[PDB]
Structures are given as C-alpha cells and as structure tokens.
Amino acid sequence: ARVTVQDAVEKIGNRFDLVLVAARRARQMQVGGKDPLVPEENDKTTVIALREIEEGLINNQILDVRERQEQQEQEAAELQAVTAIAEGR
Amino acid sequence: LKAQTKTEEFDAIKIALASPDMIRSWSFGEVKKPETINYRTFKPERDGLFCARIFGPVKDYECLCGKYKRLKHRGVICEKCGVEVTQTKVRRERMGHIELASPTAHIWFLKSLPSRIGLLLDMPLRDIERVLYFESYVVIEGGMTNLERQQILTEEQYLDALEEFGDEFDAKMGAEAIQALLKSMDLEQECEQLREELNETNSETKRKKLTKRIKLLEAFVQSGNKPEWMILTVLPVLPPDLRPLVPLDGGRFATSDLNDLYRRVINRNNRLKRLLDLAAPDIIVRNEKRMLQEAVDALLDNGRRGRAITGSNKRPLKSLADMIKGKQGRFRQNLLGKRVDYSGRSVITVGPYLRLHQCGLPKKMALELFKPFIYGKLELRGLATTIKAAKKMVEREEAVVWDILDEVIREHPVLLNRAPTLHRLGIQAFEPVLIEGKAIQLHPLVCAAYNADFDGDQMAVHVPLTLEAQLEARALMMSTNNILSPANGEPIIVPSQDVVLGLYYMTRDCVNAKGEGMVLTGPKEAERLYRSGLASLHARVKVRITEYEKDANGELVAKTSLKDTTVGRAILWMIVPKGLPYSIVNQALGKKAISKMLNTCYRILGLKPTVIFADQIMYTGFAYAARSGASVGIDDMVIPEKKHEIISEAEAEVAEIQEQFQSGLVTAGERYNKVIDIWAAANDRVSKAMMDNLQTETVINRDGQEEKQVSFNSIYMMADSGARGSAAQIRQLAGMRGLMAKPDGSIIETPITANFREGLNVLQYFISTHGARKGLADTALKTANSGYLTRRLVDVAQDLVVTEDDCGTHEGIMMTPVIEGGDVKEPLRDRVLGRVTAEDVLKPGTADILVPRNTLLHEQWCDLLEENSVDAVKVRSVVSCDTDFGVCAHCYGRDLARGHIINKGEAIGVIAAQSIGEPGTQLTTGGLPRVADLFEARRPKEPAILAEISGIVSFGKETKGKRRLVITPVDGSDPYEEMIPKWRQLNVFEGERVERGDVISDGPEAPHDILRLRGVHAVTRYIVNEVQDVYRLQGVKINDKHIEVIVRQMLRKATIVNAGSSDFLEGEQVEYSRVKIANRELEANGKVGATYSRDLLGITKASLATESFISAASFQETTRVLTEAAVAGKRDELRGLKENVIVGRLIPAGTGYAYHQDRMRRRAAG
Amino acid sequence: GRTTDPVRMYMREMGTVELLTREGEIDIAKRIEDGINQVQCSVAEYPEAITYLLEQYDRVEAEEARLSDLITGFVD
Amino acid sequence: ETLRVDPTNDRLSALVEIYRMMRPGEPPTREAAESLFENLFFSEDRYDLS
Amino acid sequence: HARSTGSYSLVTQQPLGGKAQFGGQRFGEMEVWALEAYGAAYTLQEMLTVKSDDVNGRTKMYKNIVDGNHQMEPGMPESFNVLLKEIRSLGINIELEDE
C-alpha cells in the first residue's frame, strides 16, 4: 500500500487540496473514463492516484488542461450536429 | 437570466414571524375534527389530525377510498374523497391549520424573559396577562379625553369613563385587546417622537432607556415582522407521520402527546364557535377563551402555565418546544450524537506483529461491514448472477468470497475510535488486516494516543464509504501521518513500557561479564558474538562502527571509528538509519532518551524513516524484553535495613514533645505541628534510605576485589527506565507509606509505619480507605470537569480556521526564557521553536542578519540562534494577527502532526481547545479550577489594585468605607480620584510616584485590569504564563500557541469610546470595528475614525456571541434564541462550522474550505 | 390575587352572581314568555310570513316536501 | 424579635397564614385552617414518627 | 458487534437495531470535533448524512457502493428537515433563502 503520503504532500502543498486532486483523479479512473498514468500494482484508484501525484504527472493544473481540451473535443464532434439546429431561427 | 424557481441548492436561512396568510400557505386543509382514526378500519377520519385528504394517502400511490390503486394515476384527486395519489412520505411533509375563533397570544413571545409583546408595546407583563385573563380593561388609542393610551382601567372605571366619553375613547380586554394595541401601533411616529424626547432632556436615567428603545423599534421595523403577528389568528398543525399513531404488538397503539394537545385545542376551539353561535353569557364564552388560550399555550410550550398531563398518565405531555429542545443538553441531535451505518465495535487486543499503519480486523466483522462492496464486486467479476444471488453466496459464507473480501479490504482504510474522544488523535485510520477471532488488534505504539489499556477497553470501527473519505482517511486520519502530538511537537508514537524495558536492558552496562574489553569489526559480529552465548548482551567493549552525517549540503558524509560502547548498543545500532550519530544509542536509553532518538530521526531523515525506525524499535524492544527474562519477585522489593531504627528515633521525638506537652512547655497546636514535622521528616529518611540501598547496592567484582554500579534489580530497572513504576510507588512498596488524613483533611499524626511488602493492619488499612475513595471520586469527577472545559473551549473557538496565508504584520510578542527565580524553568528554545520571527534579529554585532524577518524557525534555525547568545526573539502570535475572521498560517506557527508550516484551511481553534483539554484530567489557589478561572477571566476573591495613572499620589478624605486616593500626574489634569477602602492594608507610598499598573496593594489581580491599565500584550502574557504555570507544574507540555488562540477569542469584543459611525458604548467585534475604521481613515469622511477600547470577555461569555442562530440554538437556551432571532428577522448565512454540521452540509474548514470559499466568492458576485 | 389557573379566574367570576330566589325564577320565566311571544306575534303580523307558509303547504301536498319539515305539529 | 416580625395576633390569625401558606391562592376558612393544621402533625392518620 | 445496513427508526429516520441486527455506533459531538480538527469534511458529511440520517442518501449511496462508484449525493439530513416542520409548526416562519 501507500504507507505515507508525505511525498504527495510535497508536490502540491496544502495537504488538503492533495486529497481533493487525488479524489478527482481517482474518480477519473474508478468510473472508467480513463486509465492509469503509472503501473497498476492492484493498488486501488486511491493509491494509484496518489502515486500519480508523487510522480508529478498529476495535479490541478494538468487535470484542468485535460478537461478543457476534452470539452473542445466534444465541440469538434457536435460541431456539425448543433449547427444543424439553426431551427432556432 | 431567470435565477431559478424550484429546488436549487439553497444558501443561508431566514427566520421570522408568520402571517395568518403565510400560515395558511403551508396549510393544505383545515383540520376541523379531534377524531383520528375510524376505530375499526383504521383509515384516517376525514377531516382530522390524521387525514388522507388534508395530508396524504395512507399507503404508497393509493387512494383512500380504494378506487384509484394504480401507479399510473398520480396527479389525480379522487372524486369520492380528494386525495392525490402520491408516495406516503408526503404525510411526513404536508402541513395544515386551524382557524381560531378568538385571537390567541403566542406564549413564546409572552413569556420570553424580556417579554416581546410587552416591551414592544412598552407595557409591563403583569398588566398584559391581567388583561388577557379579562381581569381588567386596557385603553387603546385613547384620543384626547382623560386617559393614557396604554392605561388600564377596571369594571367600574370603564363604565364611568364610558358614560362620560362615548366615542373618541376606546378600551377592550383579553387577547383581542392586545392584538388591537399591536395593530394600532405605528412604529414610525414613535421613532420621530422618541428621537426628539431623547434630544431634549439631559439625564442618564432618561436617555439610556430612550436610546435603547428607539434602536429596538427601528430594528423591529427593519424586519419584516409587524406587531399583530405575535397574536395567533391561525394555528399550523404538524404533519401526521411526525406525530404517528402507529400500531404495536398485541394490537396495541402508541402515539405522540402532540395529538392529545392538538385534540384539546381543536375541541375547545370548536366548542367556542358553538358557544358563540348559541349566544352564551359573557362569563361562559370568556372561560372558553381562557381555556383555549391555555390549550394553545400548552400545545406550543407546556409549563409556562399549568403543565397539562397526558391521558391517564401523570407525566406531563411533551410539547413542540420540548420537541425542539430535546434534553441531556444543550444537545440538538447532531450535537449529542447520531447512529451511523457501516460501523461496529468490540473488545481489543494487542497484535505486536503489526506495522503501525495497520490493525487486525475480525473476519466476520469485516464481512458484515463491507457487505455491499462484497456484493458489487462479486457480481462485478461474475461469480454471482445477480445481487440477490450475491447475498445468498455471502450468507452461505461460500469459500470463494473470502478471496473477494481480501480484494475489497486491501487499499481501503478503516477508522478506529475509542470512547473518551479528547484530542483529534482519538480517531485514527488504519489498514484492515483480516484476522481470525472476534477481537480487534490495535498497534501498541498507538495505545498512547488512544489512552487505551488492554483491560477490556472496546473500540469502534467505521468504514469510509465515499472515495473522498478513503483519501481523507489515508492522507489525514492515517496513523502514520500523525506521529506527533498537536499540543507539542514531541512524538506521541514514543514506545510505552515493555519495549523501553527491552531497549533499556539491551543498552545498559554492567561492570563485568563475558566479552569484556574485546574488539570487534562491527555490530554484525557483535550480535553474532552475543547470540551464540560467547559475549554478554551488556559488556564494555570497543567496536568499529560507521556512522553517517548528512551535514554536507543535502548529502550524507560517511565516517568510521573505534567506539567505546557495549555489545548491546552495538547490536541496536543496526536499527538506526543513516545520518543519525552513534552518540544517540551509546547512552542507557531511558523512556526519555528513546523518545529524543525518534524525534531527532524525524527532524533529520523525514517521515518514512521515522515510521519504519519506530516499528523496528518496538519489535526489538519486545523481543529483547522477552529475552531479558525480567520479572518481579517478593524479594525484589528491598526494605531498608535501617528502617526500624529510623522509626524508633522518630518515635522518640514524639515522646519528647509529648512530655513537653504534659509539662506545659509546648501548647497543643504547636505540639501538633512538631510531631507532624518529625514524622514527615522520618518518611523522607526511610525513602532516601531505601532509594540508596535499592539503587546502587549491587556490589560486584571486576579483576580486582570490588566495584559498585547501578542495580540490575528488576523493580528498579522498571521505575528507572520509564517502563512503569516511580520512586513514589516504589517508596510505598518498601519504605513506609505516607501520612493519611481524616475526611476532614486534618492530617493524622501517626503515619502508616508499615508498607505493602510488610502487611498493613486493620487500622492502617481502614485509614488508607478514605484516601482511596476520595481518590476515585475526585478523578471520576475531574473527568467531567475536563470535558466541560473542552466544551466551553471549542464553543468559544470553533469557526476560527486558518483563512489567509500571510497577513503581513511586524507585530508580535517578545519571547524570552521564563527564567523563574531559580534557573530556567523553561528554555527560550521551546518557546520560540516552530514559531515565526516577527522581525530580523541581530548578532551581538549588527547589520548582521542571521534570521531575516519571517522565517519559520525550525530546529536548525533555533540551534543557530543558540550558537550565538541570543536572548530574545520577537514572535508573531495568533493574538496579534491582522487577518479578520480567522488566522493567517504565516502568523500561527508550524505546529501540526507534521513538522511543516500549518496549511490553509485547517481549523486551529478546535485542535487548540482539544489540546488544552486532553491533559486536563492529569491536573490536580491552583489546579484545574485555576485554569477555568483564568479562561473565564473571573476577578479573584481578594484582588489588588493598580495605579490608574502614573505620577505622584497621596491620601485624602476619611473613613467612609473608603479613604480616597488622589492621583497627581505631572502635566495632566488631576481629576482621577479613586476610592480605596481603608480597612485593607495598602502598599503604595504616600510620598512617592507610581507608574500606571504599579502595586497600590498586594494580592492577585483581575486580568480585566491587566488589559486596561497595562495592555493587550501584557494581558495575553499574564493569561498564557499563568495557565502554563498550572500545566507545567504538573509536567504537562502545551505550546503557548493554543492558549494564545483562546486568548484571541477572549478579547474578541471591544467597547467604543469616540464616535462618527456607530453608537457610543456598544460592545462590538474589533474585526468589524477595525475593518470599518481602516476603511474610514480614507474615503468616507476624510477621517471620522472612531476610537474603541479592548474588552476581555471570559470564554463562557465569549461563546455567547455568535451571529448564526442555528449555532446559538445548539448550546444555548433554544427557546429564547429562536424567539430573540425571529423578532429581528435574523437571517443566518451559515458560514461557521456548527451550523453546517447541523444542516448536514460540508464543513467550511478542511477539505471543505475549497468548496465553501469557492462558493463564498461566487456569492455576492457576478 | 389571581393565581391564574383559569379554574380560579372562573370560580371567582361566577362566585359574584347571586343565587336566585324561588319567586325570582318565576320573574325571569315570565320575562322569557313576554320576550318570545313578542317575536311570535310580530311574525304573525307579517303578510309574507303567512303567504310563505301557504305556498309551503302547497309544496307539501304536491309531494315536494314532508309534513315534518314544515310543522312540528300544531297545537295537536 | 421573632414576635416583632410576626404579622399575626391571635390563634386563628396565625392559622389563616399557615393555611394560606400551604394551599395559597384560595380563600381561607376557619374549619379549613383548623382541619389542615390539626391534620398535619397532629393526626393519627397523616403523621407518624413511628 | 457489526452493521452495514439495518433497520431504521420511524419517528426520525436513524439506524435502529430491532432484529438483534445492530444499530450502528453512535457518532457523538467529540467524535465530530475529532473529524473537524482533521481536515476531513467528506468523512464527516457522509458520517452524518448518507450513513445515517438521509433517507434518500443512504440507498442512493448503497447502489453506488455496489456499482463500484464511490460518491455521495447527500441532500439534507432528515433530523434538520423535521426540525423545520417543528419550528414552523409554531408561529415561527423559517425559510430557506435564495439559491
């Protein structure tokens, strides 16, 4: 397991916002919209997320940028769908 | 954009008086009948207290008459009896009403201590009630005739005044009268008139009252309540499922008393309607109005009239006010407690094999606890066709599921809690380890924090369901993440007893044994030498060791040498990781040193190494303690060979003094003191005999004839190491035990001359008994007192949380060593450690900045400080923080379970209160009451007085109970003249000058004075130093920080002096004031700024001040709080903790800070 | 004074009223007779009060009502 | 001095104050005061030290 | 003793053992303060909402627990919701402002 979180608290400061970010990420994995950024040892989404924090590939900034990209990915698809909704006129 | 209409997620809450029409808004029908159910078919009788038509269907999606039974028909109101078919849950929701015939007073507003209707109308209570009972007539809108508007007449007087004054004079009686008064009342006119009246007459008596009243009136206008509202036209009825009739076994029924009450109200009201339509005499209808008023009053709040008793049962029926109040408090049901799913408990056991990050969890318990998880997983993999089948599998306890439970358990921590939760460490999170048996296994090192012995204490487990709770449990509540007390940076994971006897027995040296004086390549072959029996565990030996030092820049230096040590120390060194010096293990390793080892290890190598180190220390401690073969025999307790002789001589003294008393040479009292003194000395003699004998009397041979060292005697090693026992108890075991006292407290002059090792006799034991019982009773009481203190404390602080980061002020308090009278009762180091420097400090020489302004002083910075001679450091305190509505992390301190600076959003007030309160049982004027007195700011019984102002003073007038002191300052006016009672012996020199805050007499002083005549830093210093005196005298470690936050809450309020915005003498928030005058100094009036004066409010008083009424209604008197808030139409915005706990939403501290802040800013914004 | 407990504020309030003399009961009763009979006679002197009763009986024998809902008996 | 603080004068004057002490609020009666007082510590029914 | 989801009390919906199926551990004020000193908001919310007092929350949660989704859609605890009716039963109008 992950016995101490201290390195994770090292990367992002607050020690609370860590729990929050890790929660968000662990949810990205748990309800499966996504997959791990680090080898799954049978560590649950909790610890996988934490490991992802330690290795500095996951924090609030990164997740925000990713989500903001995905919004536009869906805009790209529905681009032809919702413009055909010109029936608003 | 339409904001929204239907349910969004709300914020704040509002409370006010309720309209006849607004009361009708909630009502879905008028209950016209006292009847409940039919008596055979138990269906609700329409229309009554229990009704399907007014309230709802009896069963889900089913009409009462039975016509429409289908879930398809929903919004249909049945033609037969209109009942919309909808879930039966709504019968727990929908309200109703009753239209009262005559107006009725709302007893909450009549009997509230400052009677609301009364002081609104500026009418006395007795007059109002008098009128309410039809015992007198009261004028309304008297016009110009003979009579005052509020004046009260009698029968004869009313008739006379009527015969004279026709119209243009008006009087009524009863509730209708009071309602007429309230309705006729014009607040605005009163406002104008009162402002003028205020202005004209100069007398304190007049204008104080005047101003209070006008402010009250404008407050009630601002509302929105209007006066008639205090009088009830319409009476709402509580939804029936909230006062249920539900059946029982034996066909029996049980129901709430609210049905009895409501029934009474309805019956009397209907009867009044009847008596009106029958044209009954006044005497009757009046009695019916009185009875109805009594009924309504009994229903709302029972006990402010006659205390009606429930049917056939003597016990007074509980009313709506009592429904709200609850009891055993002060407890509002979020407060006292709430039952919780996914949880359990059992007896606990040891489990030393555990890493400190885990705990043994019984198989069955873990099965029942994780049940839904197990179901979902089982069918996730496909071992179970469906959830139903998954239950049947786990119910079969099929062989497969244990392997699944192994999965659901792995990364998924559980919360362990013990009964007396004091500080936050009372709950800790561990990793479940599946265990055969019904008992929970709790790591030994944690036994300290829980205060949990193994004598049958029980612990409770809770499962953190949601993901956020799992991560909160792992990153916050986790065992390994709190290794340090929040009260002080000292390790709470310190090894307890068996282990310390182990490391002590390992590292100690005898004078001689196998392997003495040989040489070995290293610890490896030292252990290898010992295990094979060649070399004794403890023998003086030189061995080559390699220590490390990280003293390069973030880099470990290696060095090796020949150390003169023992085989034991050598073996133990294998456990010490990396950078620690060999010096740490080369001592005797007592419970104290064994702790400083861990602490140093933490502050050097970090968390992880400290954790694994601690684990290893426990393991080796137990193992070697077992090897040691330590035991306790009857001969292990050695009675001094000189005891009998000491007893004899001391016994001769008593007979000397006795002969002197017989000869009259000495009086009775002085004699008593003498004999008591001689025996008291004898006790010390025997104690300091047995301690020498017990301690050093191993006399053993090395090479030459003899040498003598400290004893290997078991009980001694126990008491010495810190394992258990102490010189007092050992003294009671070998030497004579004490002197006892009768229940009086008069100390018996014949001490117990025998100890426990020898047998006590009948008398000695009987006399010991009182001391015993007083001990048990006292401690059992001090538990309660401690609890009360913690409660007062968290009530006073709570919502104070770290809010901002750096308020950026140079302000702080001047930190010196306490230096009391002897040497150094506490060092400067401990006082300044983990704190932040207010400003850059000098070397003895200057323009030399060693520590630059605000830098958390960590252990290294502190040691640099100690290298230089630095005697003083100004330190930022929570009391001086410029930040409003909280504390900035930069000003708080570093302290936490972690060594790093405090995080944004942690709630420090709570942990401060908890930290002050946890040791509170340990404390023995003095003592715990002293602490309570300090925090309550209570003026002592026989206080001193401080000079009101500097300058030369002198005595004037005479002997009127006070002989006046006339102060004479140099430049200023004289006029300060204080009256000091002359029958107290003074101090101040009649011919000398005295600075403000000097001693004009002796005796303790009230901290109010210390604040006023000395100042804020002076008073905070006084409090902190006094309470710290109380604790430190008991050997309790509490950092100044917590007491300082408590102090900050104490002085929260301040009373205004000057003007330009608000009223003259108002006690008000400094945060408010300072914000307003800082805002006022620029803009506004160029500067109108208002002066204030700091106020010291005791904790129990400061807790009283709260903006949130939901919070106040919790720990205060609920009945009064709800009224007092309702009149002002007070709108609670939540904000604080207690209210958010009550309403069941996220705590605005913690993980919640992100949310609430994010929302708080979204609010009052775009 | 008043101890509240409305049993008292009642008991004391009625306790003022004096017990009737035997003859006084007849005084009151006679007063009742006078009083009622006045409204009975005033009803008798109203033409519409007659015609209405007529039309109502005309409704009774026409089977639009019953004899119990008009008269509670005459004398007889 | 106790007497100097005594509002009463004769036996019945005291019995009134005692009865109005025990069951206050309601009009005193002679037979009532005597009955109550004799019933308190002096009745074989309502009082026993054993 | 141990319990996951048992019987519930009628008057206020709260965990109640009736079956020798046990009512869960009582989580008191001090135990709440313990959670308050730690930064754990969610542990506490779920402690006094979904795990106990929320009649919707408990079941809506349970389904997520079995679905393999750890979340909570808490809503309002039934105790406070009752207290609103009890307060409003008097001449007191207690509302929920704004949005």
Ligand SMILES: [Mg+2]
């Ligand atoms: Mg114990």
Ligand SMILES: [Zn+2]
């Ligand atoms: Zn129907």
Ligand SMILES: [Zn+2]
């Ligand atoms: Zn600050």
